[PDB]
Amino acid sequence: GEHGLELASMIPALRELGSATPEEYNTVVQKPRQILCQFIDRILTDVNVVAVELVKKTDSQPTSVMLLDFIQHIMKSSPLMFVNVSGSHEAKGSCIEFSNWIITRLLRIAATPSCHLLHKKICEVICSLLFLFKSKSPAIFGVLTKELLQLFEDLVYLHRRNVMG
Amino acid sequence: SAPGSKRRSEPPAPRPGPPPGTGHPPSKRARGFSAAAAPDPDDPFGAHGDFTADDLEELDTLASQALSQCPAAARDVSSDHKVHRLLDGMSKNPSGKNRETVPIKDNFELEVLQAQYKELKEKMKVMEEEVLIKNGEIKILRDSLHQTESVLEEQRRSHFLLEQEKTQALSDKEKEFSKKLQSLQSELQFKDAEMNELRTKLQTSERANKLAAPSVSHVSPRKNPSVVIKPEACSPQFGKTSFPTKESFSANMSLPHPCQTESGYKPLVGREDSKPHSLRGDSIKQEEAQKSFVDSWRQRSNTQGSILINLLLKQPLI
Numbered sequence: 317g318e319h320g321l322e323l324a325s326m327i328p329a330l331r332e333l334g335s336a337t338p339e340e341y342n343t344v345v346q347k348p349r350q351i352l353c354q355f356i357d358r359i360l361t362d363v364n365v366v367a368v369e370l371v372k373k374t375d376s377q378p379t380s381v382m383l384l385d386f387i388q389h390i391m392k393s394s395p396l397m398f399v400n401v402s403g404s405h406e407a408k409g410s411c412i413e414f415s416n417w418i419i420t421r422l423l424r425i426a427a428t429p430s431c432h433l434l435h436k437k438i439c440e441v442i443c444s445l446l447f448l449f450k451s452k453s454p455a456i457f458g459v460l461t462k463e464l465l466q467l468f469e470d471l472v473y474l475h476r477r478n479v480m481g
Numbered sequence: 482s483a484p485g486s487k488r489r490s491e492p493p494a495p496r497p498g499p500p501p502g503t504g505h506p507p508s509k510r511a512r513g514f515s516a517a518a519a520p521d522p523d524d525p526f527g528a529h530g531d532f533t534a535d536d537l538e539e540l541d542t543l544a545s546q547a548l549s550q551c552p553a554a555a556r557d558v559s560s561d562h563k564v565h566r567l568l569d570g571m572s573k574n575p576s577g578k579n580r581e582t583v584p585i586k587d588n589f590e591l592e593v594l595q596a597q598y599k600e601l602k603e604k605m606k607v608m609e610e611e612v613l614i615k616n617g618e619i620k621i622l623r624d625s626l627h628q629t630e631s632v633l634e635e636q637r638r639s640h641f642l643l644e645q646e647k648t649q650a651l652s653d654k655e656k657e658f659s660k661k662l663q664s665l666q667s668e669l670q671f672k673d674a675e676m677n678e679l680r681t682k683l684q685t686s687e688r689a690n691k692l693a694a695p696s697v698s699h700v701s702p703r704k705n706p707s708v709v710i711k712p713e714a715c716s717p718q719f720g721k722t723s724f725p726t727k728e729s730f731s732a733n734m735s736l737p738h739p740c741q742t743e744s745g746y747k748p749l750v751g752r753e754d755s756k757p758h759s760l761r762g763d764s765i766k767q768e769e770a771q772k773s774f775v776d777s778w779r780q781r782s783n784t785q786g787s788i789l790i791n792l793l794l795k796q797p798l799i
Contacts, residue, residue, distance in 0.1 A: 459781075460679070464636075466632035466633060466636065467633075468633065
């Protein structure tokens, strides 16, 4: 019932980010959001095999897409949510597959940045690149990609940073 | 008499400048397989027991230039299998010269950047020859690239079914138990080996490592409470990555009832002092101004590590 317990507030966390007209309601949304990783801290992880491990990662990645949807205009809240998302994978004892999927999430924007060479447009995708720029800061805050530095690591994404250059 | 290395640098200098020119990377196997006759097929005779280009002169290190040619143009599968039956000819047989130390590293580093580039399987048979041709008294650079050698192979040695990982279950940190390493880069060779230790789940660690080369790493880490300074910018991050090893021990010793440490409370002693210095790693001045990456070492890589300090207090508590 842990995912059903995870179903209880995540849609409510999908609800509080709907109206982006805060007057300290995004502060009232981040107080739900930053506590949710603290709610994800002590429990709701460290569990059954890779189906349920990806299933806790699914609504994570679904809310990460909602965090990716949080491009305009609460920037550092998503950056607060960036390491908060990284706190889960740090506490995962797992998710190196999801880190390679985060490397694929890096590769999701990388070929999109490679497609931004001939055609960069749709400023939300420029804003979601800025959301991915704090994800690069979250990758900078990850530093277990250097635990994959044996695997010809994010020099690839530094080439994407050279593509971001 | 005065053109040894500068004139020898012009090969990759020609190679990289044209690599930094223009479009797609089929040139990675075009000029290289043309130039592959110049060293490897030039060493193809194997006059027993000495190749024709390798064991005559010291300038048989265009494999490093071939590794530079491997580093020249990065797309997408070209030069490796183009050198595949060449390395199965040359580098499969002309690598077990058992000393080789003039670019024995770059011989492996040619295969390393090959394994870094792309592929799964042709180098995965070549790691058996590296599992064959190994040493415990190798040179300080020969031990150094050896730490990189299984490292570049580890990505397909953890591809899906790990494909080479249990082949070195006896050629594990036994090889890291070739202790008494050299100066701080050879200390960093263990730090890259610690960086190489991120994969390979913890079923049978007692035969493979027993956290005993990790205790020898903890022996470096027990020194590391004050062993380094201003290469501590490397080494405290290496200590911060050594903090992951206790978190790795938290995922192994505090996984199901092992505790893994017999004569290692002495080893976990200054580790606990390094755990005292874990959150206290970036606490000399701690100002509120940061240029690009300063205070995040003992803040964000101590966020998991203060937990890993409490998870250094999990198999054996505080």
